[PDB]
Write an enzyme that holds these catalytic residues in place. Sequence first.
Site, PDB file in Angstrom:
ATOM      1  N   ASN A 147     -15.664   7.909   0.362  1.00  0.00           N
ATOM      2  CA  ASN A 147     -14.615   8.338   1.198  1.00  0.00           C
ATOM      3  C   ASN A 147     -14.884   9.373   2.290  1.00  0.00           C
ATOM      4  O   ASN A 147     -13.929  10.190   2.630  1.00  0.00           O
ATOM      5  CB  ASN A 147     -13.648   8.922   0.206  1.00  0.00           C
ATOM      6  CG  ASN A 147     -13.314   8.256  -1.007  1.00  0.00           C
ATOM      7  OD1 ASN A 147     -13.359   8.635  -2.113  1.00  0.00           O
ATOM      8  ND2 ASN A 147     -13.129   6.678  -0.937  1.00  0.00           N
ATOM      9  N   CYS A 188     -16.006  21.653   1.185  1.00  0.00           N
ATOM     10  CA  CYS A 188     -16.657  21.830   2.390  1.00  0.00           C
ATOM     11  C   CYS A 188     -16.714  20.553   3.056  1.00  0.00           C
ATOM     12  O   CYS A 188     -16.900  19.513   2.824  1.00  0.00           O
ATOM     13  CB  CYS A 188     -18.365  22.077   2.158  1.00  0.00           C
ATOM     14  SG  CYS A 188     -19.298  22.034   3.559  1.00  0.00           S
ATOM     15  N   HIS A 192     -16.383  12.332   1.866  1.00  0.00           N
ATOM     16  CA  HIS A 192     -16.153  13.883   1.456  1.00  0.00           C
ATOM     17  C   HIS A 192     -17.350  14.039   0.578  1.00  0.00           C
ATOM     18  O   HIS A 192     -18.184  13.295   0.149  1.00  0.00           O
ATOM     19  CB  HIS A 192     -15.046  13.878   0.203  1.00  0.00           C
ATOM     20  CG  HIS A 192     -13.774  13.307   0.777  1.00  0.00           C
ATOM     21  ND1 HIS A 192     -12.900  14.446   1.656  1.00  0.00           N
ATOM     22  CD2 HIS A 192     -12.850  12.304   0.684  1.00  0.00           C
ATOM     23  CE1 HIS A 192     -11.894  13.961   1.837  1.00  0.00           C
ATOM     24  NE2 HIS A 192     -11.884  12.761   1.324  1.00  0.00           N
TER      25      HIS A 192
END
EC number: 3.1.2.14
Lengths: 268, 269
Positions: free
Chosen positions: B190, B227, B192
């Site tokens: 995804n 982050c 991330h």
Amino acid sequence: GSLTEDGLSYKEKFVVRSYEVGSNKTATVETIANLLQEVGCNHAQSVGFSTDGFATTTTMRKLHLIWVTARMHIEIYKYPAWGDVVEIETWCQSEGRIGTRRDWILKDSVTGEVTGRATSKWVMMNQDTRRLQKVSDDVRDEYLVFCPQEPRLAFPEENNRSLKKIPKLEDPAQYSMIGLKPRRADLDMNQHVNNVTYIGWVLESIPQEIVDTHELQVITLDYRRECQQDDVVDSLTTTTSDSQFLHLLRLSGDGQEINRGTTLWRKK
Amino acid sequence: GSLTEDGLSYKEKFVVRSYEVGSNKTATVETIANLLQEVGCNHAQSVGFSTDGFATTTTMRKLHLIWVTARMHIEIYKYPAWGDVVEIETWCQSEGRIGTRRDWILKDSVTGEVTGRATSKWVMMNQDTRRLQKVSDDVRDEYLVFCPQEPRLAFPEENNRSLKKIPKLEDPAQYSMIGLKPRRADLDMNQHVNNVTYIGWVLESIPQEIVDTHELQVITLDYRRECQQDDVVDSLTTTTSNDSQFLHLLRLSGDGQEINRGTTLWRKK
Ligand SMILES: O=C(c1c(F)cccc1F)N1CCCC1
Ligand SMILES: O=C(c1c(F)cccc1F)N1CCCC1
Ligand SMILES: O=C(c1c(F)cccc1F)N1CCCC1
Ligand SMILES: O=C(c1c(F)cccc1F)N1CCCC1
């Protein structure tokens, strides 16, 4: 995994893991490269060679000699999906006094079709002085009994993508990713940077729009110098065209070359 | 891997790979953490959940709700050597409206002895607004049938190191690793940053002399903020202590916004 019936090649099956896939739910080229490296380790262990990435004999250990990758070439037709089983077959072959070659065939376990193939050139080097040398006859005979005698090439084509000369990228580069440093996860058991990390660093300068609309089909990478744990790398890319790119990895300070390569991508 | 006889837990065996080991020829804590994450995915798939790391139901997908890690706690007694088979058992448990807990037991396949254990706290969050919320009863009843009804804790101890409050590191830090950025290999399906990357970033500020003479025994990590792919991180460590304890802090390189805080315990080899 296990050596084949004739003991002249090695096969291993891998299930694709959740953290090993990219944004298209298929294995990344770095996951593929890590699996080729793992099956290469298991082939070297299954026949008594040193297990550590250097494939050394008692003769090489005494002389402080190691095998190092000079060139990696990978062509992928279908990336295995998460949960799929990929079967990789690997073998070695002597290339005279120049060095060794390791080849790989990637297959789908369910269909039995070739989904990828790889080839790599290895050279003999003194681990301390980092000085390359020709392969001696005492060393050649120790590994020749584990190699097919007739040529068996993953890339047979007369003059093909795996044996082409790679040019040096001219400044200014079209794209760049600067200030790249390795962390402890990027190091191997001997504290050296893993050769798969260089592949990731090369691909860092490829713009995200290419990654989102294209799939990596071919990657050729020359290894010229090693990056130390405390070195910093700059990754440079320029479009030479399907989409083709010319790449260059160099130390952030002095601009010393560590790698050069080419990638070919297909529109999804 | 497969669900156990009662269908209230999942087991999977893994062979330790060559590129998964550190300088001691044993698995790294990041390899262990990746395997716990993989066995957690397979448990969620085996019973019908989303599988993308968010363990969502059709109800959670409709409401744009995901499960996120708030805390990870890992204790390792023996790191599996290269070539060794490790067997991991995982299960979930409801913690009321606060969230869910996922526990793990790591065993040696040959000896059957417990070589490690882990526990994690997950919270419900809206994917878009990033706003945490308490667990609704419609959601609770969808996963409760896959959890043991009596408590089953990997860390049972009345006074245990997995539920302690972690303080904020005071400047100046004793050690630091500055300018850490994620690459594409650090991202999940995804796009991330993978939770295991934060563990590696925390350990980057631990000096090499500690890594060369000590072995990591315990790691507790709180997740406060994510982050982004284009964010830059600073990793800070200070010694709080035969055993060595450290206090850690991950914060954005620019504004100094906190993303993680934690503690590590190491023992002399
Ligand atoms: O000597 C070997 C080797 C082999 F020739 C057969 C089987 C296992 C081996 F490590 N190699 C040199 C570098 C590439 C692998
Ligand atoms: O010094 C290296 C090298 C290494 F020894 C490890 C990793 C990357 C490297 F470029 N080479 C020179 C001959 C080809 C490989
Ligand atoms: O709802 C679940 C879950 C479960 F409760 C049982 C089995 C598989 C599951 F994904 N979880 C949310 C946080 C991670 C685990
Ligand atoms: O913002 C985050 C977070 C996330 F949502 C994804 C990854 C890392 C994170 F720190 N959290 C708030 C408390 C629970 C975790």
